[PDB]
Amino acid sequence: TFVALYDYESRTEEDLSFKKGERLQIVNNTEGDWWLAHSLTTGRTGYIPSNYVAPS
């Protein structure tokens, strides 16, 4: 479980957009620095830049 430190606007069809303060769960973080995440806040799923979030 992670919290967004910045807003992030999707740059690909596979990305997850989010706002600062959103809480996210990692679905898969085994493929690189982009993690597949699910927003606990919005219910959406997609890739996020791992340096935009912090553990909670």
Next chain:
Amino acid sequence: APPLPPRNRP
């Protein structure tokens, strides 16, 4: 905001 990481490679 931080620079974005490179996209994942296969």
